[PDB]
Structure formats: structure tokens, C-alpha cells
Write a protein that binds this ligand. Structure first.
Ligand SMILES: Nc1ncnc2c1ncn2[C@@H]1O[C@H](COP(=O)(O)OP(=O)(O)OP(=O)(O)O)[C@@H](O)[C@H]1O
Ligand SMILES: Nc1ncnc2c1ncn2[C@@H]1O[C@H](COP(=O)(O)OP(=O)(O)OP(=O)(O)O)[C@@H](O)[C@H]1O
Ligand SMILES: Nc1ncnc2c1ncn2[C@@H]1O[C@H](COP(=O)(O)OP(=O)(O)OP(=O)(O)O)[C@@H](O)[C@H]1O
Ligand SMILES: Nc1ncnc2c1ncn2[C@@H]1O[C@H](COP(=O)(O)OP(=O)(O)OP(=O)(O)O)[C@@H](O)[C@H]1O
Ligand SMILES: Nc1ncnc2c1ncn2[C@@H]1O[C@H](COP(=O)(O)OP(=O)(O)OP(=O)(O)O)[C@@H](O)[C@H]1O
Ligand SMILES: Nc1ncnc2c1ncn2[C@@H]1O[C@H](COP(=O)(O)OP(=O)(O)OP(=O)(O)O)[C@@H](O)[C@H]1O
Ligand SMILES: Nc1ncnc2c1ncn2[C@@H]1O[C@H](COP(=O)(O)OP(=O)(O)OP(=O)(O)O)[C@@H](O)[C@H]1O
Ligand SMILES: [Mg+2]
Ligand SMILES: [Mg+2]
Ligand SMILES: [Mg+2]
Lengths: 252, 255, 253, 250, 243, 237, 253
């Protein structure tokens, strides 16, 4: 009798089921027109400049997603990155505005340009698991106005869970703590971030990426439990797009 | 007082006989595969209809082509095609002379019996929910073709009542198993020199570029986790020159 | 025997070594006051950034940085503020903002351990520093009326030894990648990252405390900073973790 | 369709969020006080260490650390002393040290931007908290009394769920490397490294500032620190580089 | 009414029990020769044959090519007193095909040794069961394997989902272990893996003792190679001259 | 202005660079003996091969951490009928369990090289190699007259060249999966373990810097496992 | 025609010349004896206990090389690693002499035992090259022989050398700074150290290793010009030399 080991027996697709899988899982409707426009305002640093442009955009019917003032290491000069939605006619109007303001130099449009979008996020994440996160969340809500009465029936359920620290040994909760810490660390690493702080029950992460990616990280790291988050607005700096000599000289 | 006890493992040791008995037993088999596959490299002038003309010729003569990929060099009106064939030297050489005679081609080189760098690209979406879920997910799409219901209930109920199926696991343990599987796959693709380009709630996408014999081994190791979606290229190559030391090349004993 | 010149590295004397350490001393930072940090917990409503910034502008508050950060909580934001002044002035500034309807509370991070950080993106030329000295003058000539002294100095610059107009194509190429390498290793020592590489420039990315950011830009300055963009300042509080043996501070009683 | 249970993790609201953030605010600053760092440049004469340490001991000075270290210069030594007290007392200490004739001068790196470094080497168990809790009790009853006391402690620590004696050797083997990986991640993150790996323990080294080096030992404390060896603090002044657009306020 | 979090309750040493543990936990030299030999036909059997005829207790003998035409260097490791090793050195040096044999014992050298090992990714129970099979005496051993295949964490007593997770857990443990040492993982299979390590003989032997519980299926240790390094010390240490 | 390849000139360069068959139809035969560690087993395995005229390239006795058991990875050339003959000769020896044939198996070949490489440039190495050559003549002044020779450079240079060379050697060593284990004032020692042909490539690339000492040893072998997917495993018949 | 190349082939060794170099470069066995001894004192923290032990070693003429007080994470317990050279007879006398002290528990002898030796060094290294370093050195060497400025002729030949920054364009001294910096960085990376500070002129390296590697490293960075240096005494923490199941089976009687 040779040393026995159970065959896992991994099932394999056929051409039919494989197609139906790709067909079904592929985002066929995709999304509605999401396209956002970005602007780069070059303003002069005067005692009252931020309130002007930010207030001017508010004076009109403009929806502003983000607006950040960036110092450019030049005396009395600031670069402002504005993110807004709408259509080309409305955006150009907003771009034609602000530029007319005298403390500004120019308002460039990077919407149809190849740029580098970068936000900065810093978040403290719990290492005590999901059960503790529900416990902590319900606690800061049941203090006042969590309905029309108490929530002790809900609290008792969360603390009745299997993987709640109150039901686990000190050695087991320690390993799950470092297991979670590593899981967060590996997510942060793949996204190209850092772990700048490690405490007894939490850790602080730091990540710089485009809004598309920097929010995808927050979704993947959400189940661990975000205790405190801070996400900056979008910074923009146009890169220099390069194409090979063969693909270049496309004079036609 | 006694010292804190420890259950001694005492890992058993080999002896001279059982060790040799193990090595001999674990021996594979020589020449389990026939003659090594042949790799051809076409230098084709980039004019409209070349892909249909070349590939159409091989199909019109019944040549067992394993893979054919056209690569765009950084030269105007010049493309490179890498073809993989099977068969005797006499049949494959004829295939070379048949393609090279075509008008829009410059020359068809034979890369077999030559030191080359074979490369291939694969991108695969891998499930993080585990083995049990993959059995459920795959069998679910099979019922869209099998047109069976009452008979398949014996299978799906058997699967969903397994221990490590997500339905039977708490939400906190499924989360850990997702990242445990993720860390396993990530460590697995890193050893192969690959990347993890996408991470989701339920799956991840790995990217790897290596020789076919390397990728197939990779896709076999990742297979138990459950490959939801795969894209594997043909095969391209670039000739290598085997360097030898001045002492080794000085051995010109051609007497 | 095959000869090689002894470089003969001289050693310090006990007095000469002490003399240098003292001469290179000090660079003291006995500042009149630190940089006070405030953190406003703010409800999201139309024209709320104009309110906080406007209130600080209406009064004689010398603020340095004001950046609004978004939490993953619906209708909730953070405003990390950095300003100058004394304890009495800024505490009054804290109560000024806190009385505003949209805000919930304004915390003070001045006397607390926080993680100061700001993002910075810079475009740096890979060509010589003399090329940057030429490019600098060219855009200034496009500002100040008339060339005049421009043609007198541009001749002095363009005749320097390591100007890309006085070197073969292979030399400048090897100089661009050498400059590129020197920059990449600078942004590697710092927690940075090179995100773009052009034919005559490159873009670096760095996120750290304003101390390192200011230090980093000072180091890449000689190469020639074409563009720059520094964030305000973000902050997250951290609690100083002390050992169990260091609970003797509790035994101090 | 496959089941797959949901992970409806609760979301913060405006009220509960600001309530938690406010709750996590300190006093702040009740204890202790600011530390002073001094740097002595002394002649390497026989008995200098006895002079300086003896001087600070004879006086009413509470020194935290004192580190002698060579400087690759003949008969020249450098010492880094960490003080405790008001600025007046510290300066009084500095002058009394400098007044000694084997020392050239004594610098004050307190208000200066310096690089603080301290070395640590600790052997950390891999058998978990239960075994470490057992290990301490065995060595404590070997110095306290020869009687068979604390019977309901050794019996309580043992027969615990994750004590090695209650696990198969397979799990203990994995737990060793599981703990090892956790510790290794701490060291790699803190900028340290593992220099030794035994069957039931490992030795890690770490060179960082005193504040950072203490936070590390607190994180690796629950794993069980068998031996430890924290160096004293070394200090070297750096050259701070503010940007070129600072100009002047007045 | 705040979320319950059980304290670790981690105990701490006192001054007495600490030093008590330190006291309790407180506890021949090899000779290395390097022969410079002209690569004559059948010279390995000439040197090794000499060491056997004279009755020496040599540990290793690895022949290395110096990348020079008709020149090889042999690193020989042997134990014994300083007197008997000099005899072994002189005995070899007298051989015609050898140039000179150097004594690398009293010198700071870089001792190296290559090891390739195949380690099972399955549990230690499977390894304990696998050895019994190849050792198989099938009469009384039928009861022994019963005590083995009964144990949990044996692949036969676990779902394939967990076994798969155990394979990679052990794999990551071996990988993290071989990464601390100057090693690497070369081959990964669905049952085992192959590691490669090169360091001083003490490190290899230490590494194999650590990877031992996982169950080493197949191993291969090279002889000890040696290459002398020159110890560098500072100028103030170089100036420390005594008459 | 950087020039570009022509559609025709590109093809010409490819076929011109494409190497002629620089290898025999025969291949690298690898035999792995499983021997009993008896006194004098090494001398008789070698003796049997040497007395019958077999072109062996290496031997390498390897311990297997099993009591009184060793294994030898023998590499030789010749026809299949000759190698099989050489195999049967060794296996017939009574302290030999079996001699496995790896000449047609997926194996992992490993040589281990340690070499001290000079950092003082090609000029100094050319001088040093000529100095030690004179044993058992106007070139010594011709070499020491060349540019970039240490004696013809300032003290600030050479130091800057030594580390430049050090960086080059390190980058070569890193790419091949090796490491620099020692850094002398005028040289450095590298350590590399890989395929014998990969070692030969490394010792050729690092050759111009000057190889002071070298130790290549021999090749070790351990069988790999050809894993293929479930759709390539179902490619039977 | 054909594309030319400057050289044909690199020269090779022969069996006679190869063994000639190996025998010649093989180190002379001078330091066969003369080993150092490592002691570890488990001491109770009494007021002025350091000056008590160090005073004992000095008063009895013991040749100690380093004495470092390490703090354990235990109340009132500190260990001291004493490194001293001498013969076995004298060292044991030193050990027994120290151990006889009241505040010490016991003194262990880590000599002939597998321990982890570790020193910590922080050094400031110039990036301006060799010429500038012997200029800066001679500058603070003016403490002696300042009569009639006799150092002028010694200074003159220094500042008139090719790669002295005063004779180089500022564009080249920049690349020379970073080239030197990368030579130091790739050097300290090899030893397991790290560069923690980079400035306009110099940089600070940090390396923790056994005293042998520390000294070897300082000998390699010495030519670049070490401005400041600080290396602590070694710390000692014994390890456990493991050996395989067939290695430990050397139970021969
Ligand atoms: N679910 C995700 N959403 C967004 N980003 C992800 C996700 N998963 C991983 N990433 C990050 O995306 C990175 C891969 O992007 P990559 O480096 O290849 O740039 P890219 O090819 O230009 O992609 P894109 O064209 O979308 O910008 C991963 O290394 C990882 O850091
Ligand atoms: N089961 C496997 N089959 C094939 N390749 C594997 C397998 N497991 C791992 N690999 C990959 O092979 C790599 C090792 O290949 P290696 O670096 O030795 O190339 P090599 O020296 O040229 O040898 P070979 O000629 O066999 O490819 C591993 O790092 C890993 O990335
Ligand atoms: N000239 C410089 N000025 C400021 N920071 C620098 C300079 N050069 C390098 N750095 C950065 O300082 C970092 C070292 O700081 P470290 O990681 O040791 O934190 P630290 O021990 O708390 O010291 P600090 O108080 O200065 O922050 C380097 O990794 C490097 O990125
Ligand atoms: N000149 C360049 N052109 C294109 N890509 C570059 C260039 N220089 C660097 N890169 C690559 O871009 C990478 C950084 O972009 P990354 O993909 O990581 O973020 P991203 O925001 O997703 O980029 P993008 O939005 O342009 O797709 C670099 O790591 C580098 O590999
Ligand atoms: N709980 C902790 N306490 C102290 N340091 C930690 C802690 N957790 C992590 N670290 C370390 O802090 C480091 C991050 O600090 P960093 O290198 O950025 O210096 P910094 O920007 O000057 O901040 P700081 O002033 O706190 O030193 C991480 O490398 C991390 O290893
Ligand atoms: N139990 C062990 N036995 C031997 N070597 C180990 C062990 N554990 C780890 N190692 C390896 O030893 C390495 C540390 O070696 P190190 O750099 O300190 O050399 P060293 O300073 O000369 O000290 P030593 O004399 O002990 O070799 C670890 O990085 C690790 O790779
Ligand atoms: N000239 C040198 N002197 C001392 N150490 C050096 C020198 N050059 C490099 N090193 C460092 O020594 C390291 C090699 O140490 P290694 O890992 O081989 O430990 P080891 O096997 O115990 O060697 P040893 O017995 O000599 O201590 C190099 O990686 C490098 O970091
Ligand atoms: Mg810091
Ligand atoms: Mg070592
Ligand atoms: Mg390969």
C-alpha cells in the first residue's frame, strides 16, 4: 500500500461553458459616460487667490470633484488642478473663465492630453478582524441615535461570533493580527504603497496612485476595517509621450 | 520542577537501501516525447495579405502547425513570423522551402538545432474563493449546455456541503482564505518571474512571460486554485550565441 | 613588479579632527515657535472651502498650508491646516473655525505625534546644468523686454565645455543616462519613484514629510528642475509605543 | 447560482466617524519630559571613562545613557550622553564635563537635527505565548523557593489550547515558521534583519532611533523575548537642507 | 459597553530569573589543504589513492578547474593534529604531477559548498509514512502505518482544498527559510520542491537541520571549496605596530 | 540624428549574424551513480573509467545526508553505445547500487565558481600576467606606457575606475544570479552557481577585467519534473 | 570594408605562471596565535556601577579594547560586553576579578564560542574627491607650524592637481559627487549598510556588522575621505550551531 493522497480532481471547462463564462462575466453594459475633465490653473500667490477661483466656480453651476493648490518652488506662483464633469462646451466655458481673473496666468486643459494622475491616501486599518470592526462601528452609533432604542441585541450577536477576539485565545488573536497585517501589507505592496506604522491593534498605510487605482485599494482593504482615512485631491503633471521612429513620421 | 514539555517530532532518517529504493522509483522515462519540435523564422515584407498567404499555404498542404505568430520589427515594411512545426526533418525542411519561395518573403530561417530564446506570454484570471467554489462555478455554466437539473442536484449539493466552501464559512474566514490564496499565487508567480496585475474581491490576474515548457508548468501549479479565464500566446524567438571561455574554445582538437 | 601610484590618503590629527567637527558646528534650530497643525472635521456642503479659507483670510492669520482631504465617509471631509503664530493666536483661530456651522470639531495636532506628509512631482532635465542655464535665460528673454544682455551671456554659456552643443551625439547620450541614474538613485534613497522618462527629461514622484521633500528638491536642483508641484500637508496621528519595562515612567508617580 | 455569503461590513456615518476620531485624542503631553543629548570629544587617555561617568555620578545628574566609541583617529574618542532635566541643569552638566582636561569640547545636539541610532539584539521564541509563559515560570520557581508552589499555574499554562504539548508536531512546526514569518515582517519593515534561526527561536538585529527601537520590542514582546541587548544611543549631526525659496521673513 | 479585547497578559523577567536562564542556556578543528596539480591523465586516483594508502581521515576532496590549460586545484579537508596533517601535505607535494599544496588552515578563507535538496511539500506525516514504505517486514509495520495514517494533517485525512493550502504554506515556509540563507527555490512541483544553497559548510548543515522536519526526499552536498581572502583593517589599526 | 535600418539591410544583418552549427550532433551525457561509501570507492570508480579510456569532464562526489551513501555526477562524451557501456562498467562494481542515465532527462545542472577579479583595469592585468610569465622583454615598458594604466593616471582616477569596474562586475554577477562576497583594495571575489554553459558565459564576460584566481569544480545534477497543463496531458494519441 | 575593433584578444594564463601568482599572493601565516577574548558581565544596575567595573580593569592594567553597557528589557539588569586581548591565564584572572564584584551576577566567557559579534558605525564621507580631502585636512592642520605660512607650498601642489574641484567645471563636480556617492552606496549596500543622509558635499553611512567587516568597510571608504566617524564597541549574543541528524550522529567513543 503506497502512501495515499486524495486527488483534488480540478474540473475543466469545455469550449461551450468557457464562452458562457466569459460572456456572462464580461461587463457588457460597461458604464454610462463617466469621462471627467481636468484643468491646470497657473495662478499668482496673492493674499486672496484661493477664494477667488474656488468661489467663482461655485458662483456658477459647476460641479467640482476636486481642487488642490500645488506650490511649484517658484516665488509667488501656484499650480491648481481642477477636476470637473460635463461636456466640452461647459468645461471650456469654465476654462475660459478663471483665466480672465487677473491673478492667474493661464488655464491649461489636460483632458485630451497624456498626463500622470496622482492622489495621496493615508489610512489606519484595524488588525483585529471583521467582527471587532462591527463591534467598534456599532459602539460609536449606539451612544446616541441608533434608532428609537438600544442595540444590545445586535451587540450580543457580534460578540457571539467565532472569530471575535473575546472568543479567541491571546495566542490565536495575535497570529490573526499578524496574518491580517501581512495581508494588508501585500495589498499595499502590489499597489506600490508603504506601511509606515504598526501598532498593537492597527497599522497605517500610505499610497500614491491615480484615483482609479487609489480607490480600488480602499475597496480591497475595506473588509479589514478602516479606522481612519485621509485621501488627497488629484494632482496632475503632463508627461512627455514617446513613440518609436517607425510609428512616428506618420505624415499622411 | 520540570522543564516545559515539548512533543518531540523525531523525523525519521533514510538508510542506504530505502534511499536508493526511493530515487530509483522516482525515475521518469527517456524519450517519452518524439523528435523535438522545429522552429522556423520568416522574414516577410509587410504587404497586405501576407498573413493570409503564409498561413493559407501551410493549411493547403496539411502541415501540422502548432503555433504561428507575426512580429513587427522596428523596420519599415518588414515583419517577422515565428512558426512551430512537427514531423521529420525532410517534411519540415520542405515546408521551409515552400514558404521561402513565396514572393513577399525575404528568407525563412531554421532555428531548430540552434541556441535560441523561446518566449511566450500568458495572462490568467485566478479564483480566490478556493477549490469548492470553483467546482460550483464551473458546474453552474455546464448546466447551460447539459440541460439537466434533477440529476445535477446530487453534485452541486455535495459540493456546497463541503467544509471549506464559502457558504459554510464565516465572512471573516473567507476573507483570510482569499488573501492566503492570493499570497500563495503571488509567491508562485514571483518565483516564475511573473506579476500580479489585477486584484479583486473574488479573483486576481497574473502575467507571465517565459518559454512554453515554463509556462505550462506554471499553469499546472496555478490550476488547483481555479483558472477562470486564460490568454496564452503562440511562441516567438530570438537567436542566442552560446559563449564559451577562451580556454574552452582553444580546444580545437580537429586532428 | 607592476607599478601603481599610492593615493596616500592622509589621516586626521586629534586636534585637526576636533577643529573640523567644531567648525562644522552648529546648525541650530532654536525656533521661536513650531508649525502648529489643525485638523478640521468638516461636513460637505456647497461653498464650504470658501468659508474656512475666507475666514482665515478675513483675519490676520498667516497660514502656510490648507488642503482638504476626503474620508471614505459620506458627507465628511478633513482640512489639515498649517500656520504661524503663538499659542494664544492660533487657539483663537481654532475656535473661529470651530464656531462655523459646517464643521464638527477642530483638533490640534501641534503637541501630538503625527505623520506629516506631502506629495511632490518634479520634471528634471537629463541634459547638462549649462543647458538648464541656457534654457532658463531663453524663457526670461521671452519675458523681459528686448534681448540686450541676453546675446552677451548666451554666448558665454553655449561655449562651455559640457554644453550639449559642444559634445558628440554619443557623449550627450551617455551624459543623459548618467544624469538619469544620478537622479534615480536620489529618488531611491528617498521613498520616491521615477514615473516618466523622456528624451531630455524625466518625472520623479515622492511622498514624505516636508523636511525630506525640501531636502530632496535641494539635491535635484543642480540638475535643473523644469517643473514642480508640492502638495499642502496631510497628517495622521500616531501613538508613541513604549515598552513594558518603560512603564517605570508610570512608577515615577 | 453559487451562494457566496455577503460581507456587509458597516460603513461609518458623519456622526460616528467624528465621534471616534475625537475619542482617540490625547491629553496631551503629561509625562515625561524632553531629553537632552550631549556629544563629548575626548582624548583617549587611561581612565577617561572613569572620569566622565564618575563626574556625572558624583553630581546630581540622571543620565540615561553614555556611549564611548572610536573615531578612527589616534587617541581620540567620542561619547554620546543622554540627559534628563531643565535646560539650566543640562548646561551646568555640559560645562563640568568640558572643564575636564582630557576632553577638547562638549557639544549640545539637543536643538540640532541629528541622526540617533541604537543597536539591539534579541532572541525571540517561536513556540508561542503559552510556552513562553511556561518558560518564565520555570526559571522563576528556581530562584524563589525550592518548594512545589504554583501548582495551579503550571497546570493552567499547560493544557492550554495552543501550548506545544497539546498540539501535534506538525502544527507546532508550522506555528514556528508562522511566528517566524510574522517576526521577520516586523524586522524587514523596521529596517532590521534575522541573523540566526534555531529550532525553537531566532535572533534579530535592528539599528534605529530609541523611540523606534522601543516600539519594535513592544510589537515582538508577545512572541516572547528570551534574551535582549539594547545598545546606548549614538548621535551624528546631519546637514538639513531647506529649499532655495525660503528667502526671509524679517 | 466598549468592545471586549482580552489582554495578552505577557509576563516579564525579573533580575534573578533572567540571569538564571542565561546561565542555563550557556554551554576537532578542520584542516584545509589546497593542492595545485597539473592535469595528468588519471591524477585524481593518484592523489586520493595516496591519502587512502597512508591511511588519512579526509572529509572531502573536490577537484576544481582554474580555467587555465592543464591546471587544476584540489581542496582537501582533513582532521587530525598539526603534525599528521603536515605529513599529508608533504606526502602529496612529493607527487610528480602536483606543483605545490598550500595550507589554508591558519588563514582567513571563504569556505563554500553547494547543496541541492528535494523537500516534500506535504505534511510530516506523509514523509513519515513514505519512509516506512520504502523501508518495506510488511508484517508488523502494518500496525505502525495505522498509527501514522490515523493522525490528522495527514493528506489522506484532509479535504483536498486544505491539503493544497498546506502545500503552499510549507512552500512559503521553506522559501522564507532558504531566503534568510543565501539560497533560492529552483523547482516547484505539486508534491515537492527543489532548493539550492551555497555557503560555508556550517550554514548548509544548519540549513538542512531546519528544513529537516518538512521531510527531505532527496539531497546532494558538494565538497568544500576554498578561496583565500585578504583581511582588510583600517589605517589606525594598520599603524598599530609593535616591536 | 539616429539612423534607421533599411528593409533590405535589416534582413542582410540577421542572416549574417545567424551562427553556423557550432555543435556536434552528440550531446552532454550525464550519469548519476549511487555508491556505497566504502574506503576507496572514489579511487576505483575513477580507475575503472580512466583505465578504459573514457572522455570524462567531471566526477563530483556528493553526500546525500544518508549514512554510508554517496552519489557521483559523471559527465562524459561519446556515442550512446559507448556511454551505456561506460554505465554498465561502473554499475558492475559491487559498492555501486545503480548508475542512472540523465542524458535524456529534465535535470538541474549546477557548477560552483569562485573567482578573484582585478579592479585595476586591463593594463595592470596585462602587466601582471607578463611579470609572472618570466620564470624558468621590452613589452614591460610598452604596457606601462599605455593610457588608462594606473601609473599613468592621477590618484583620484583609478580609485574611480576600480569602483566603476566593481560596479560592472557586480552587475554582471547579479544578472547571472551570483554575488560579490569579498571586496579587496585592488580586487574582488565573486560567487556563482548555475548551468555549466552559463558559468562559461559568465567567465567569458568577466574575462576582460582580469581573472586572478578561479575555481570551477564540477557539475551536480538533480532531476526536474516536466509539468504540463490538463489540456496537454490529454494530448494522448 | 569591415567594421574595425581596437583589440584582438585578451591575454591568458599558463600553468607555470598561474601557480606562480597563487603561491606569491597567498598570505603569510604570521598571525597564527594572538586571539581576542570576549567576556559578558551580567550586572545589577547600581549607582555608579559602570565606573566601578571600568575602574577595576584600568586599575589592574588590563588591556581592554572595548567595554559597552547593553540594556536588557529587565528591571535593574544590564549586560556588559568586554573585549580584551591576552592569554588564557590573564583573561580568566580578569573574569574572576570582575565577577568578584558585588553588583555583578556572573561573567561569561564567549571566547571559543559561536557568538554574533556586532559593531555599529556611522561615518560622514566627502563626495568632492581625494584632492579636496587632503586640502580640507591640511586646512585644519594649521594648528601646528603656522609660522611664516610654510604650508603654502604644500597646499599649492594640491589645488593644482587635475581632479581638484577648483580646476573643474561645476557641471563635472556634480557628476563626480554622485559617481562617488554611488560608489559609496553600492559599497555600503554590499556590506549590508545604508546611506541615511545626503547633502551638497557629503553623505552619512550606517553599517552594523562584526568588527572585522566594519574595519574592512572603513578601509574601503577611506580613500573617498571620511569627515566624521563613530564606531561603537562590539555586542555579543551567542547562537546555536545546528547540525544535521547524521552530523550529530558523531557519538564516537
Ligand atoms: N483592481 C485594481 N484596480 C486598479 N489597480 C490595480 C488593481 N489591482 C492591481 N492594481 C494595480 O495596477 C497595477 C498594474 O498596472 P500597471 O503597472 O501594469 O500599469 P498600466 O499597464 O499602465 O495599467 P493602465 O493602462 O490601466 O493604467 C498593479 O501592479 C497593481 O499595483
Ligand atoms: N516545475 C517547474 N518547471 C519548470 N520551471 C520551473 C518549475 N518550477 C519553477 N520553475 C521555474 O524555473 C526557474 C529556474 O530556472 P533556471 O533559473 O535554473 O534556468 P536554467 O539555469 O537555464 O535551467 P533550465 O535550462 O532547466 O531552464 C524557477 O525560478 C522557476 O521560476
Ligand atoms: N539630506 C537629507 N535630508 C533629509 N533627509 C534625507 C537626506 N538624505 C536622505 N534623507 C532621507 O532620510 C532618510 C533617513 O531617515 P530614517 O529612515 O533613518 O528616519 P529617522 O531614524 O526617524 O531619522 P529622521 O529624524 O531624520 O527622520 C533616508 O532614507 C533618506 O530617504
Ligand atoms: N516615458 C515613458 N512612457 C511610458 N511609460 C513610462 C515612461 N517612463 C516610465 N514609464 C513607465 O510608467 C510607469 C509608471 O506608470 P504606472 O503604470 O505605474 O501608473 P499609471 O497612472 O497607471 O500610468 P498610465 O495612466 O499612464 O497608464 C513606470 O514604472 C515606468 O515603468
Ligand atoms: N509603531 C512604530 N513605531 C515607530 N516606528 C515604526 C512603527 N511602525 C513602523 N515604524 C517604522 O517607521 C518607519 C516610517 O518612518 P519614516 O521612515 O517615514 O521616517 P519619518 O518620515 O521621518 O517619520 P518619523 O518622524 O516618525 O520618524 C517604517 O519603516 C516603519 O518600519
Ligand atoms: N542557524 C544558522 N546557522 C548558520 N547560519 C545562519 C543561521 N541562521 C541564519 N543564518 C545565516 O547567517 C547569516 C548571517 O551571517 P553574517 O552576515 O552575520 O556573517 P558573520 O558576521 O561572519 O557571522 P558568523 O560568524 O556567525 O557567520 C543569516 O543572514 C542567515 O543567512
Ligand atoms: N573585504 C571584506 N571584508 C569583510 N567583509 C566583506 C568584505 N567584502 C565584502 N564583505 C562582506 O562580507 C560579506 C560576505 O559574508 P558571508 O555571507 O560570506 O558570511 P560567511 O560565510 O560567514 O563568511 P566569513 O566566514 O568570512 O565571515 C559580503 O556580502 C560582504 O557584505
Ligand atoms: Mg525618520
Ligand atoms: Mg559570516
Ligand atoms: Mg533557464
Amino acid at each position: 500500500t503506497r502512501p495515499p493522497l486524495p486527488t483534488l480532481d480540478t474540473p475543466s471547462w469545455n469550449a461551450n461553458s468557457a464562452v458562457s463564462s466569459i460572456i456572462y462575466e464580461t461587463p457588457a453594459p460597461s458604464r454610462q459616460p463617466r469621462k471627467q475633465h481636468v484643468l491646470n490653473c497657473l495662478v499668482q500667490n496673492e493674499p486672496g487667490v484661493l477664494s477667488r477661483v474656488s468661489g467663482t466656480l461655485a458662483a456658477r453651476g459647476f460641479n467640482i470633484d476636486s481642487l488642490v493648490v500645488c506650490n511649484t518652488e517658484v516665488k509667488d506662483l501656484s499650480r491648481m488642478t481642477i477636476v470637473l464633469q460635463g461636456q466640452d462646451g461647459v468645461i471650456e466655458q469654465a476654462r475660459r473663465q478663471i483665466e480672465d481673473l487677473v491673478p492667474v496666468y493661464a488655464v491649461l486643459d489636460y483632458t485630451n492630453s497624456e498626463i500622470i494622475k496622482r492622489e495621496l491616501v493615508m489610512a489606519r486599518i484595524s488588525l483585529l478582524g471583521t467582527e471587532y470592526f462591527e463591534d467598534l462601528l456599532l459602539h460609536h452609533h449606539t451612544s446616541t441615535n441608533a434608532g428609537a432604542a438600544d442595540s444590545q441585541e445586535l451587540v450580543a450577536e457580534i460578540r457571539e461570533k467565532q472569530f471575535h477576539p473575546a472568543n479567541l485565545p491571546a495566542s490565536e488573536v495575535l497570529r490573526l493580527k499578524h496574518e491580517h497585517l501581512n495581508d494588508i501589507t501585500n495589498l499595499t505592496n502590489n499597489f506600490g504603497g508603504r506601511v509606515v506604522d504598526i501598532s498593537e491593534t492597527s497599522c497605517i498605510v500610505e499610497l500614491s496612485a491615480k484615483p482609479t487605482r487609489i480607490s480600488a485599494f480602499l475597496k480591497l482593504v475595506e473588509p479589514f476595517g478602516v479606522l481612519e482615512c485621509a485621501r488627497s485631491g488629484m494632482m496632475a503633471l503632463p508627461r512627455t509621450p514617446l513613440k518609436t521612429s517607425t510609428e512616428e513620421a506618420a505624415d499622411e
